[PDB]
Amino acid sequence: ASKLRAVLEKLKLSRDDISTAAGMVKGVVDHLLLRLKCDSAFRGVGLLNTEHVKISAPNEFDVMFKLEVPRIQLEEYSNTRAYYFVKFKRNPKENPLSQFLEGEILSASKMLSKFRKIIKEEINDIKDTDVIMKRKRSPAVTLLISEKISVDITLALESKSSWPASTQEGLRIQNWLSAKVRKQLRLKPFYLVPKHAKFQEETWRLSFSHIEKEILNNHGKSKTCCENKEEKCCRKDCLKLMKYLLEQLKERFKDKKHLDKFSSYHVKTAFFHVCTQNPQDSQWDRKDLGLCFDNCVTYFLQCLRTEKLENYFIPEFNLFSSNLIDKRSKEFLTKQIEYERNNEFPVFD
Ligand SMILES: Cn1ccc(-c2ccc(Cl)c(CNc3nc4[nH]c(Cc5ccccc5)cc(=O)n4n3)c2)n1
Ligand SMILES: [Zn+2]
Structure with missing residues (x-):
């Protein structure tokens, strides 16, 4: 915290x-x-x-x-x-x-x-x-x-x-950012x-490298999220900490190969899935930074162990399938993250 x-x-x-x-x-x-x-x-x-x-x-x-x-x-x-x-x-x-x-x-x-x-x-x-x-x-x-x-x-x-038909059921932001916003984004190139x-x-x-910025700049269920003192959320901070966690772990084990296939967009994907699961701004209270970060870590670990991580835009594409990342690599990252969580995240220092 x-x-x-x-x-x-x-x-x-x-x-x-x-x-x-x-x-x-x-x-x-x-x-x-x-x-x-x-x-x-x-x-x-x-x-x-x-x-x-x-x-x-x-x-x-x-x-x-x-x-x-x-x-x-x-x-x-x-x-x-x-x-x-x-x-x-x-x-x-x-x-x-x-x-x-x-x-x-x-x-x-x-x-x-x-x-x-x-x-x-x-x-x-x-x-x-x-x-x-x-x-x-x-x-x-x-x-x-x-x-x-x-x-x-x-x-x-x-x-x-x-957008091509494979995207039709992606960008599942309706219950979070609204059906109106989903329509507006899908009018972009x-x-x-x-x-x-x-x-x-x-x-x-x-x-879809241009979508993240659009969401991050207008990321709340409330239109006024993060525009005043009574509505400060920790969504951007949690994403930054997930991205930094993976960076630090890739650097710690850069002389091995087990983390070479993971990158920031895996972390981005899992983060925005947590935003869909937790659509309300009260679930992202600045005061709850440590607890919210933990939701994100826990969900990313669940993705590793089950070998299921849906692309955010093309939900039938599994970023964590066996053909793309093998069981051994997913099991290695799981162990490192679980060690970080249980030791008050040493890598950050
Ligand atoms: C860099 N790489 C290497 C391979 C792929 C890739 C693999 C499969 C599919 Cl199915 C696609 C489909 N296309 C695609 N998927 C994303 N996901 C995000 C991350 C994100 C999530 C949620 C909100 C905003 C951003 C960024 C991005 O630019 N894309 N682009 C891309 N990507
Ligand atoms: Zn906010």
Whole structure:
């Protein structure tokens, strides 16, 4: 309760502390977009959220470029619910992405190659800052700025049509944020990013990287949640502590492999499931931070032990299935978390 608050305070002070890092990243990114926009395949390219995956690493940034693709035809791959072939409707007004077609199918490989190549050409043009490009270890392109700051650049396709049918029963926020809000969010665009399941096929994965911010900024059942003193909730703090718990555990055991397949979006997913289960703001009273954090831990442990964690958008996709993460890894993380809970969370210090 008091220990958790102190953890949150030290995290806050490093975030809010004076840093030239964001200015250096923006300068590099703005150069790239100008270079990409001159190219025929990428003239519509722009920034998605005009981010930090690790709270413990303030020099590591995550950036997403988006490209609008109108009249897109999506074909689900092998019933995976999340992976799709990208085809183009027969509306030929010269498609800018034709050079990436392999048949009727849009090739992620060929598109990333030319994105990669154009970026590489603008890197070796900038003289002010030293920018170093790493070699395709997806997640698309990783840059190194002044040997301290690192940026992962992801290329996403953007569609403004209705979300695919696999999402129909997801985003189960009706009893928490309202049916009206669920409708508003589902009018936003959706995104597609490269990579396949399990030979390599040219499939894209659905991406909803823009939804979390929308929820977190308007997260209460009450419209006035966290706008006054009588309605302060701990939802954002609990999510931060879950993300930091996993980070610290991945760092403690980084020389082993048992935690390599877990990442923040697993924690995000399980957190927002607890928000669905506990929709009222009184279930998230600031005074109950330690107890609320415990709900979240307990639910995440239940997910590990049962090997069931539904994607928040595509509920039939089990993030914790045997084919994606094996029993041994889930059993290892369970033991570490259970040890943390029973020892007043050592990792935080
Ligand atoms: C990064 N990765 C690697 C593989 C996948 C992935 C796997 C299966 C599916 Cl079925 C999908 C479907 N798409 C998808 N699912 C999420 N879940 C959240 C987390 C979240 C939860 C609740 C509210 C807000 C955010 C973030 C995000 O961007 N997405 N995108 C994505 N993702
Ligand atoms: Zn609140």
